[PDB]
Amino acid sequence: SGFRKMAFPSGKVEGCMVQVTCGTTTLNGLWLDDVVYCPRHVICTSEDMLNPNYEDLLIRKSNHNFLVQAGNVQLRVIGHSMQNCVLKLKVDTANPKTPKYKFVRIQPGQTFSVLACYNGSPSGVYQCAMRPNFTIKGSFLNGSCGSVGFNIDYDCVSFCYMHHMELPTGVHAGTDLEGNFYGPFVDRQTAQAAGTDTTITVNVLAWLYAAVINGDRWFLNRFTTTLNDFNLVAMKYNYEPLTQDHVDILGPLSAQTGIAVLDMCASLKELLQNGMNGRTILGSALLEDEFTPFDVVRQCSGVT
Amino acid sequence: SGFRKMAFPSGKVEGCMVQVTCGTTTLNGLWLDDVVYCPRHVICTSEDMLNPNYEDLLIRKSNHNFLVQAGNVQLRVIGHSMQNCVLKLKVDTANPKTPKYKFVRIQPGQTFSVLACYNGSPSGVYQCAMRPNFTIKGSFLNGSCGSVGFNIDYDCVSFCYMHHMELPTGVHAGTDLEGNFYGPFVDRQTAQAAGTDTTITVNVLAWLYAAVINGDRWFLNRFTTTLNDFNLVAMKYNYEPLTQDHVDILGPLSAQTGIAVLDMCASLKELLQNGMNGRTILGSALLEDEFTPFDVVRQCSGVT
Numbered sequence: 001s002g003f004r005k006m007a008f009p010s011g012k013v014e015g016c017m018v019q020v021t022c023g024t025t026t027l028n029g030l031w032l033d034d035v036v037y038c039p040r041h042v043i044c045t046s047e048d049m050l051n052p053n054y055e056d057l058l059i060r061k062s063n064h065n066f067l068v069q070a071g072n073v074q075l076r077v078i079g080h081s082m083q084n085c086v087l088k089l090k091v092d093t094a095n096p097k098t099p100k101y102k103f104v105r106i107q108p109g110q111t112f113s114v115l116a117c118y119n120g121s122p123s124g125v126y127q128c129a130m131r132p133n134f135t136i137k138g139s140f141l142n143g144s145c146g147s148v149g150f151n152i153d154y155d156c157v158s159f160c161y162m163h164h165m166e167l168p169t170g171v172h173a174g175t176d177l178e179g180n181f182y183g184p185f186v187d188r189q190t191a192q193a194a195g196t197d198t199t200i201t202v203n204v205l206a207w208l209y210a211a212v213i214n215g216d217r218w219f220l221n222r223f224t225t226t227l228n229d230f231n232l233v234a235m236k237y238n239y240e241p242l243t244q245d246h247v248d249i250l251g252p253l254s255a256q257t258g259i260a261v262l263d264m265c266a267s268l269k270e271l272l273q274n275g276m277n278g279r280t281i282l283g284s285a286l287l288e289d290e291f292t293p294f295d296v297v298r299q300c301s302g303v304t
Numbered sequence: 305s306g307f308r309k310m311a312f313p314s315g316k317v318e319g320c321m322v323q324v325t326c327g328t329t330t331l332n333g334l335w336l337d338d339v340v341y342c343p344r345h346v347i348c349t350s351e352d353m354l355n356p357n358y359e360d361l362l363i364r365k366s367n368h369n370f371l372v373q374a375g376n377v378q379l380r381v382i383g384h385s386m387q388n389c390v391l392k393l394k395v396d397t398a399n400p401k402t403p404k405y406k407f408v409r410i411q412p413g414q415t416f417s418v419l420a421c422y423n424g425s426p427s428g429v430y431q432c433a434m435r436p437n438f439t440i441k442g443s444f445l446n447g448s449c450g451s452v453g454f455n456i457d458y459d460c461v462s463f464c465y466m467h468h469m470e471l472p473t474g475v476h477a478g479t480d481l482e483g484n485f486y487g488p489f490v491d492r493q494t495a496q497a498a499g500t501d502t503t504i505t506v507n508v509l510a511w512l513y514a515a516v517i518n519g520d521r522w523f524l525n526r527f528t529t530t531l532n533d534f535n536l537v538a539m540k541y542n543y544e545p546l547t548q549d550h551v552d553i554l555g556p557l558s559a560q561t562g563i564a565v566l567d568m569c570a571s572l573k574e575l576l577q578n579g580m581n582g583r584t585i586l587g588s589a590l591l592e593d594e595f596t597p598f599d600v601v602r603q604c605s606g607v608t
């Protein structure tokens with residue numbers, strides 16, 4: 001028993017982290033096969049971040065202008081290209097530590113582990129969710145750009161995120177591994193609206209199931225509700241509407257606990273309308289939404 | 305900016321995880337140099353866990369009775385010994401992936417990363433603290449025994465904890481890497497009192513400094529306090545007494561924010577006496593105590 005924000009083991013990703021320097025700028029790169037991926041703002045100086053013409057800036061760069069360092073050995077760059085907001089540096093050496101990998105674009109509400117890096121060196125690993133407004137609430141500093149988010153399916157690492165930017169609001173924005181930003185963000189020093197962020201209802205419900213599995217049952221009641229009645233409560237509290245797909249996704253957790261999804265929704269409804277009244281659920285005084293039903297099943301079953 | 309419960313990169317520890325089988329029982333082992341470390345209750349059956357005579361049970365075992373598997377290759381056991389509550393299986397092959405390591409006994413209030421494992425395979429990594437009552441609030445299942453806790457100082461992994469047991473209260477107990485249990489716990493199926501657990505005051509204060517560094521300043525006030533006045537509030541709320549050593553340990557965070565420790569204590573005093581009033585600090589509705597002043601400095605500075 002016990003329930004924590006558990007990140008994936010980071011080993012397979014640590015072996016892919018390199019350092020990328022372009023002029024004055026140094027950020028992290030991802031070395032997979034003979035290709036290093038990194039945010040394209042590596043070619044920029046502070047002066048041209050207001051409105052950079054990336055194609056024009058890339059033109060003034062050559063293969064030899066991109067310094068790629070793998071721990072201590074210098075990688076030779078034989079190619080460079082821009083794919084959306086990422087630069088792809090073809091190096092003459094395939095990464096001997098390249099794991100089985102995929103590049104996937106995660107859906108908002110899904111979770112992933114982040115290996116925060118500085119100068120191609122990992123500093124820590126934490127679990128987080130792609131918020132419904134496509135921002136992430138991570139922990140990043142100057143130099144963290146190029147740090148990646150991923151998931152692991154047995155031996156296959158699915159790379160989903162590359163950190164590019166901190167917005168003035170303190171939230172983090174980035175791209176998938178093809179360079180497409182999650183959300184409406186642009187890689188330039190300009191005013192950018194993050195958008196209204198709602199709570200991932202299916203994740204809060206899954207975490208309520210984790211609480212029941214882990215002994216915390218104070219919030220369970222003698223009531224039930226309907227999808228349409230629950231959704232009226234969800235709208236008032238800026239919660240994502242619960243669909244039948246979400247109910248089905250919560251099926252394994254419903255079967256494991258013997259608590260119907262709509263009975264759990266009535267517990268959530270009471271918790272939303274009345275609060276915790278000073279009590280805790282799994283050591284938390286607020287409703288947690290960064291655990292998918294999949295994360296709950298995995299953690300409570302012990303999937304390696 | 306941003307602040308998360310960040311675990312250490314787990315790679316160096318993943319390369320040390322092996323599977324240990326003794327009869328019907330299978331748990332995790334730690335392979336460092338030519339020695340595999342694992343909880344000694346691996347030699348037990350469910351029938352003798354009520355009051356096991358470990359010396360007597362170990363006598364009925366020979367080197368060939370201990371099955372050590374490193375991923376897929378069988379390790380040959382040429383020695384076995386019991387050191388307190390851990391068994392030390394001398395294998396004929398040194399671990400090629402042995403990192404620079406130390407065995408340390410952490411102090412209560414200190415934090416460490418746990419690589420939760422099942423069948424010698426890592427499933428996840430999370431950060432936690434040794435509670436003042438020497439229990440840990442981790443996430444462990446049947447088979448997780450042998451999972452280790454550690455810290456990393458540049459290239460050196462300091463092993464501090466080995467998971468042995470879940471208590472009926474849901475908390476977790478274990479040993480240092482010499483087999484000495486943290487706390488008054490014994491490795492036997494018997495009634496065991498965890499003891500009153502207090503809040504790590506120096507950690508809550510350090511996390512209040514992380515909040516100020518990360519923009520959350522609503523809780524800062526026009527007041528100050530003394531060590532003796534603050535401690536009267538700490539006792540009433542089951543908080544660890546704050547000493548001058550703790551004030552000194554918070555020195556770097558005091559200098560970085562320009563907020564004197566005793567001014568921060570008066571903010572904590574008001575928060576304890578009045579609560580959050582429905583507000584959050586770093587996304588939390590309760591006072592977090594599993595971040596040492598060291599963890600805060602490391603995360604807010606970007607130490608790799």
Ligand SMILES: Cc1noc(COc2cc(Cl)cc(CC(=O)Nc3cnccc3C)c2)n1
Pocket residue numbers: 041045046047049140141142143144145164165166167172186187188189190305
């Ligand atoms: C100086 C300067 N030059 O440009 C800027 C602002 O515009 C940008 C635009 C882009 Cl695409 C990227 C960046 C890097 C960044 O945001 N890093 C970062 C990430 N996560 C946490 C903290 C930090 C500092 C800055 N200031």
Ligand SMILES: Cc1noc(COc2cc(Cl)cc(CC(=O)Nc3cnccc3C)c2)n1
Pocket residue numbers: 001345349350351353444445446447448449468469470471476490491492493494
């Ligand atoms: C069956 C059975 N045999 O003994 C016992 C109870 O006594 C013990 C005594 C010891 Cl020293 C160790 C264990 C293993 C254990 O506690 N595992 C564990 C760890 N963390 C989370 C979940 C689990 C299940 C059981 N039941």
